[PDB]
Design a protein around this motif. Structure first.
Motif, PDB file in Angstrom:
ATOM      1  N   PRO A 199       0.808  -1.212   0.000  1.00 22.31           N
ATOM      2  CA  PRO A 199       0.000   0.000   0.000  1.00 22.31           C
ATOM      3  C   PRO A 199       0.850   1.276   0.000  1.00 22.31           C
ATOM      4  O   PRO A 199       0.446   2.234  -0.610  1.00 22.31           O
ATOM      5  N   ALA A 200       2.002   1.244   0.664  1.00 20.16           N
ATOM      6  CA  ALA A 200       2.829   2.465   0.770  1.00 20.16           C
ATOM      7  C   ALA A 200       3.380   2.845  -0.608  1.00 20.16           C
ATOM      8  O   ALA A 200       3.386   4.039  -0.934  1.00 20.16           O
ATOM      9  N   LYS A 201       3.799   1.852  -1.388  1.00 21.59           N
ATOM     10  CA  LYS A 201       4.343   2.113  -2.742  1.00 21.59           C
ATOM     11  C   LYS A 201       3.210   2.595  -3.647  1.00 21.59           C
ATOM     12  O   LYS A 201       3.431   3.535  -4.426  1.00 21.59           O
ATOM     13  N   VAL A 202       2.038   1.980  -3.520  1.00 15.52           N
ATOM     14  CA  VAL A 202       0.862   2.396  -4.332  1.00 15.52           C
ATOM     15  C   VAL A 202       0.531   3.848  -3.983  1.00 15.52           C
ATOM     16  O   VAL A 202       0.280   4.626  -4.910  1.00 15.52           O
ATOM     17  N   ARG A 203       0.557   4.188  -2.693  1.00 12.71           N
ATOM     18  CA  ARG A 203       0.256   5.570  -2.249  1.00 12.71           C
ATOM     19  C   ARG A 203       1.262   6.517  -2.897  1.00 12.71           C
ATOM     20  O   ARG A 203       0.836   7.515  -3.493  1.00 12.71           O
ATOM     21  N   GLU A 204       2.548   6.196  -2.775  1.00 12.49           N
ATOM     22  CA  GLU A 204       3.606   7.022  -3.403  1.00 12.49           C
ATOM     23  C   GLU A 204       3.264   7.237  -4.874  1.00 12.49           C
ATOM     24  O   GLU A 204       3.161   8.401  -5.301  1.00 12.49           O
ATOM     25  N   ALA A 205       3.069   6.143  -5.598  1.00 16.10           N
ATOM     26  CA  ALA A 205       2.789   6.223  -7.044  1.00 16.10           C
ATOM     27  C   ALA A 205       1.519   7.021  -7.317  1.00 16.10           C
ATOM     28  O   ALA A 205       1.509   7.800  -8.282  1.00 16.10           O
ATOM     29  N   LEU A 206       0.490   6.826  -6.504  1.00 19.63           N
ATOM     30  CA  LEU A 206      -0.812   7.471  -6.806  1.00 19.63           C
ATOM     31  C   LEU A 206      -0.765   8.960  -6.450  1.00 19.63           C
ATOM     32  O   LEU A 206      -1.526   9.723  -7.052  1.00 19.63           O
ATOM     33  N   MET A 207       0.124   9.352  -5.546  1.00 20.63           N
ATOM     34  CA  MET A 207       0.173  10.758  -5.072  1.00 20.63           C
ATOM     35  C   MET A 207       0.720  11.687  -6.161  1.00 20.63           C
ATOM     36  O   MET A 207       0.815  12.893  -5.909  1.00 20.63           O
ATOM     37  N   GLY A 208       1.060  11.144  -7.322  1.00 20.37           N
ATOM     38  CA  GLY A 208       1.559  11.992  -8.414  1.00 20.37           C
ATOM     39  C   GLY A 208       0.534  12.243  -9.505  1.00 20.37           C
ATOM     40  O   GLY A 208       0.841  13.026 -10.413  1.00 20.37           O
ATOM     41  N   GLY A 209      -0.644  11.623  -9.424  1.00 18.61           N
ATOM     42  CA  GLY A 209      -1.618  11.747 -10.522  1.00 18.61           C
ATOM     43  C   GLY A 209      -2.974  12.252 -10.073  1.00 18.61           C
ATOM     44  O   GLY A 209      -3.041  12.891  -9.020  1.00 18.61           O
ATOM     45  N   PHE A 210      -4.013  11.979 -10.859  1.00 20.04           N
ATOM     46  CA  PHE A 210      -5.328  12.512 -10.514  1.00 20.04           C
ATOM     47  C   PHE A 210      -5.933  11.923  -9.227  1.00 20.04           C
ATOM     48  O   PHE A 210      -6.989  12.384  -8.793  1.00 20.04           O
ATOM     49  N   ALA A 211      -5.264  10.939  -8.606  1.00 20.81           N
ATOM     50  CA  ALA A 211      -5.687  10.386  -7.317  1.00 20.81           C
ATOM     51  C   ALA A 211      -5.217  11.263  -6.125  1.00 20.81           C
ATOM     52  O   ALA A 211      -5.621  11.013  -4.990  1.00 20.81           O
ATOM     53  N   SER A 212      -4.356  12.268  -6.385  1.00 20.50           N
ATOM     54  CA  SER A 212      -3.796  13.189  -5.409  1.00 20.50           C
ATOM     55  C   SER A 212      -4.872  13.922  -4.667  1.00 20.50           C
ATOM     56  O   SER A 212      -5.818  14.421  -5.278  1.00 20.50           O
ATOM     57  N   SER A 213      -4.687  14.034  -3.349  1.00 22.02           N
ATOM     58  CA  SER A 213      -5.596  14.708  -2.431  1.00 22.02           C
ATOM     59  C   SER A 213      -4.905  14.892  -1.076  1.00 22.02           C
ATOM     60  O   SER A 213      -3.966  14.165  -0.749  1.00 22.02           O
ATOM     61  N   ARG A 214      -5.409  15.822  -0.254  1.00 22.76           N
ATOM     62  CA  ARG A 214      -4.884  16.014   1.094  1.00 22.76           C
ATOM     63  C   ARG A 214      -5.100  14.727   1.929  1.00 22.76           C
ATOM     64  O   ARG A 214      -4.224  14.342   2.689  1.00 22.76           O
ATOM     65  N   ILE A 215      -6.225  14.024   1.703  1.00 27.21           N
ATOM     66  CA  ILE A 215      -6.592  12.763   2.362  1.00 27.21           C
ATOM     67  C   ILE A 215      -5.604  11.616   2.022  1.00 27.21           C
ATOM     68  O   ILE A 215      -5.231  10.838   2.901  1.00 27.21           O
ATOM     69  N   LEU A 216      -5.166  11.529   0.754  1.00 32.04           N
ATOM     70  CA  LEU A 216      -4.166  10.533   0.372  1.00 32.04           C
ATOM     71  C   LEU A 216      -2.829  10.853   1.084  1.00 32.04           C
ATOM     72  O   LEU A 216      -2.200   9.936   1.601  1.00 32.04           O
ATOM     73  N   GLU A 217      -2.432  12.148   1.159  1.00 31.84           N
ATOM     74  CA  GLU A 217      -1.189  12.544   1.831  1.00 31.84           C
ATOM     75  C   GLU A 217      -1.224  12.227   3.320  1.00 31.84           C
ATOM     76  O   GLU A 217      -0.296  11.621   3.851  1.00 31.84           O
ATOM     77  N   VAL A 218      -2.281  12.673   4.005  1.00 31.34           N
ATOM     78  CA  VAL A 218      -2.363  12.545   5.444  1.00 31.34           C
ATOM     79  C   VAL A 218      -2.954  11.195   5.876  1.00 31.34           C
ATOM     80  O   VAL A 218      -2.223  10.357   6.395  1.00 31.34           O
TER      81      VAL A 218
END
Lengths: 296, 296, 297, 296
Positions: A199-218
């Motif tokens: 999940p941590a790698k998926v989060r890293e990868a997703l935090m660069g595209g249209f899945a980006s949000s304050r909720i994904l970061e925090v």
């Protein structure tokens, strides 16, 4: 610098009164139900018998109470803000309550000659003490201007949403986006970990595209790390989703993801998570999958 | 002469991705088994061959870009396919967005020939493929990833290895779960805001500062307010991507209630003539379900 | 009545008892040995074995197919030496498997091109109903072809109805399965609500049975949910497969079916807690897991 | 035989009181809000100024009011049932309200020395007039047996489900099965009609197997025929489904189909169906599918 009353000097109120006195305002308090705090009465505050007197003396009268029923009680109780409200006085409801109820409350407060502002706060105790709360206001622009400097003393992301009832509607809309974005990240990470991925790698990868949000970061990080210690409790989010669902039933809206999120929050509470951070919604879905996205 | 690269799938994204590899000084190899080689690729130096096998026999890397799982299984293991030409030091890179479970099986059969496998699905559409600003999520061996990294840098920007084989496809599906549910979240909150009398543009403007802030609220939210749903990411496509998520959930026993409902709301959108609408138009499905538009 | 020559492709858990009841009624059975040996009991009772489904079709008046999945139906129908190859005028091809209604309409058109008739007669009732000839049969096809095959359906089942039109029998089967899964969920959410509030689920069920909430599911599955009797009659895996067919159709035909969509996610919970082989009544166990509270001790 | 007060003499209360009068009982009414119906006075009913007076006179006092706060009011208001009640008196709430509120009302009334029975009814104006209502009773077995001849005069299917709160719990559970069985038939017949089948023949085929129910028999035929004239209004089922959802939020229950049914009912109300018979839930699903199961 103005006279300011504050009904509701609790976890988020007492702190909020503090950053108001700090600004140079005289605060007035009420002892009709609770006792007047220590760091307020000493730092410049006047105790009163009822919120009426408080309203009678103060120009701006701020309210911060747990739910819709508590706003109605402090407003229209015998010896309440209404009996003491009059021309050139402004009631600021800073609680997060029913927008429909708010519009009826604003109307009764205007019958005394006084004005009304709905200014629910999005921030939490991290904004309440640190005076960095988000504030969404409903009311006439004239009145908002008057209370505008008062809001600046307790927060920074201040906005006028529209007429009376629009500030509460904005807080509820935020709470829908926040709860659904937490569930969006929770369902995607459960899928990822069920498929064997980290999940941590998926989060890293997703935090660069249209899945980006304050909720994904925090909250995404918390879901991966297992840091679910309370900042925003599930129970508070259950109360906010109930405001949205009561509004949807009253105005004939079919919001199926908001409806589902409430039921997922109920599973979290059923497993002892009413006082977890809203990020802990993952543990409900995890219970629903008999699988954790964490090695535990 | 940087590298000899094959490319089965030169379509709406394949051709721009192949053109971008030629710009980087790579030698392209195409298969004419089913479709004729594009004129812009041939004029720029690509060499056409009969089957994907000859492509695999000549090239060090072989990229695949086909619409779904069955077409990936075909180009890989049909007669005169990529596997029959694959061997030691050859890298088969599937850039299609397919089943992460089928991917794991594909990878093992390609590794049996002595070749390596990378599942590197892309996010960005024809606009991102042409502009080489694509998001590439990669599953595979770390050395194999570092070998293919300069090739991904010619077709994309946000490039990340998620983990072993299958993890790239798994991250792609997770990305599509969040995007869809984030859209539904912005849509449900904005429908609730407009139905309660608030201006949906002022609510969006107000929520964009706090925890409800996302790329979806910023871009898709504007679309919902201004009413600009001309295709960019068709609902038809997101339905295929959500079906990949829901099939995996049925196979691996996941209860994902919001993903399940998003597909239903998309079916409402298609039912009202919206298969080719941008995914932002999910709002129009909820607006139809509430007999109320947040516009006009 | 008329004793017909009937071919049966699919002598498995459902086909063998079904084929045994047709022989009991006096019919002449014809089996294919193209993939499997002919069952000794079917042969002892008078069945004839032929090398392939074509020879069976050439010899028999009616040809039944009772197979598990859509690819197997297509296989026995159109393969080399299959049913279609042996089919022609006055021969009736009856698919009693439960498969896609959209794939069924196609099979019937290719069967009718031969001049043969086609009937889609999916059944409901499981092995015990097949063995007891109590199965319910929903049929799609020509009214004349249906009446021609009605005595056979009567030898294998009881509630036999022509829904009308090739594909409409499979469509009725899917609609039947949507209702059975959702009626189970309705009884389960209501009994969970009742027990969670301190009420006795058995007394709530009794009160609810004499009213608008009354159903065969409240009577049979409701009792199972209260007693904890979840040994498979109908496995959850089977219902997940059935709901997957409905959900595939909803996506293809643009239908928003939220409760059918949700019941599949709740079936996924039950499987996650080790319940793929429980009776579908055990859907309550999934909701019980979701509420962290059981309606039983 | 007995002295009976009846607070709530409306569409259902009046025929219920008329039926009790028919059994030779002495009726007592309250004029504190509405004028005592002429048909009741013309038959021997005595109109009194308030429910406190009514309770002082009668041995049994039946309440039939629309929701929880109305029951709360007639019971604990100044000159209400409680401050006129006492030993040997039996207070019977025939309304369909919150089981939680009911348990709390029961303990306050029992403190007056009186006994309490929660006896919600199922049926409409038709069943109330015909004395064929289903009655689900929560209370002490002796108290139930005492009211039993009264219940037999107003209804047919009478059952004591348990102690106080259990009658209302059984009513709410009944409304979950009714709304969900309605949604089960509507979803299945929509699927069948969209596939080209005749919903009428499907119903005929499904009525002989395990899918058979009183909802498939009655409401199924209404959905097929288009007979959606008010028997039981959606507004009323919406109110009942909210009692289920409030109880689920209170006791941590994840009930996803009950939760979704409410959303589908809100779509029905958005298209002008608040007063349709709950069988018209299909019209919501039809709107959501842009397709009717009937010839338009």
């Amino acid at each position: 610098m103005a006279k300011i009353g504050f009904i509701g000097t609790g976890i988020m109120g007492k702190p909020m009164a503090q950053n108001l006195q700090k600004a140079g305002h005289s605060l007035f308090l009420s002892t009709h139900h609770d006792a007047a705090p220590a760091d307020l009465l000493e730092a410049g505050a006047i105790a009163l018998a009822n919120p009426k007197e408080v309203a009678q003396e103060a120009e701006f009268i701020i309210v911060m109470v747990p739910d819709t029923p508590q706003v109605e009680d402090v407003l229209f109780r015998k010896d309440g803000i209404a009996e003491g409200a009059g021309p050139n006085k402004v009631v600021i409801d800073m609680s997060s309550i029913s927008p429909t109820a708010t519009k009826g409350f604003a109307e009764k407060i205007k019958a005394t000659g006084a004005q009304y502002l709905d200014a629910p706060v999005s921030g939490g105790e991290v904004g309440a003490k640190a005076a960095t709360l988000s504030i969404m206001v409903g009311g006439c622009p004239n009145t908002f201007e008057r209370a505008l400097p008062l809001f600046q003393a307790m927060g920074k992301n201040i906005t006028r949403v529209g007429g009376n009832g629009d500030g509460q509607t904005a807080k509820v809309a935020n709470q829908i986006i926040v709860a659904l974005n937490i569930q969006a990240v929770a369902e995607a990470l459960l899928f990822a970990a069920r498929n064997g991925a980290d999940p941590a790698k998926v989060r890293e990868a997703l935090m660069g595209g249209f899945a980006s949000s304050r909720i994904l970061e925090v909250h995404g990080e918390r879901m991966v790390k297992g840091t679910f210690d309370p900042g925003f409790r599930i129970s508070l989010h259950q109360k906010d989703l109930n405001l949205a669902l009561a509004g949807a039933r009253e105005l004939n809206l079919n919001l199926p993801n908001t409806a589902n999120a409430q039921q997922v929050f109920s599973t979290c509470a059923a497993i002892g998570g009413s006082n977890w951070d809203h990020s802990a919604l993952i543990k409900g879905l995890e219970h629903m999958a008999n699988f954790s996205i964490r090695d535990e």
